[PDB]
């Protein structure tokens, strides 16, 4: 789901 990509980005940039 493309709509979950930014959540993943947020998690990995923390």
């Amino acid at each position: 789901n493309w709509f979950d990509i930014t959540n993943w980005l947020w998690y990995i940039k923390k």
Partner: antibody
Amino acid sequence: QVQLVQSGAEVKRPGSSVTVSCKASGGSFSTYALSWVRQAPGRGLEWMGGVIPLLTITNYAPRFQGRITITADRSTSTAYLELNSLRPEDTAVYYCAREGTTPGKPIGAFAHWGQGTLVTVSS
Amino acid sequence: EIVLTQSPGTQSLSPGERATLSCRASQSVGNNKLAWYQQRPGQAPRLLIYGASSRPSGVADRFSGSGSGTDFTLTISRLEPEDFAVYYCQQYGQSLSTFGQGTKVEVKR
């Protein structure tokens, strides 16, 4: 905090292409998803597509695949919609919308909307 | 493509009454990624609920969302004058996001 400001109304001839812009201020432009949603006069909302700028990952609705381009310029925090081969049915208000954040974790759903851009397709 | 059905498309209600608005999906919505928006004439839509039941700060707590899978509900506990507007549901549980057709809540007289 986040504000989206779109380009002004435009009249376009049938068969032409339109570019609509959305300049964002506030928050983080590159890591949040920006979508375009349109609404024909007296009709409902239609999701068209979106982009995630950092990743240059676009996602278009199948109905518009082949007719749309969404791009993002991190240097100006501006996103662009191009819609080609315009027909009278494409007359609509076009909105940009950015996903919200928790009180920032992104939420997917569209918390922040531009003021809209009326594109009138006419001769 | 997930088809979201909002039926009825209009509800005629009185101020102070409870409203419940249905969104039924043609297939299960991934991770209950279902949002509700309000829209008034001449204005952009406004997010009321995301993730089926989460409410942004700023949004009145008389709006609540519930449901999962294919069966979602927006409840307005007590209608204020400003609540007479159009409400749209939206699923974003797969890459192709879709909206319902909208339900207009109008004043019965």
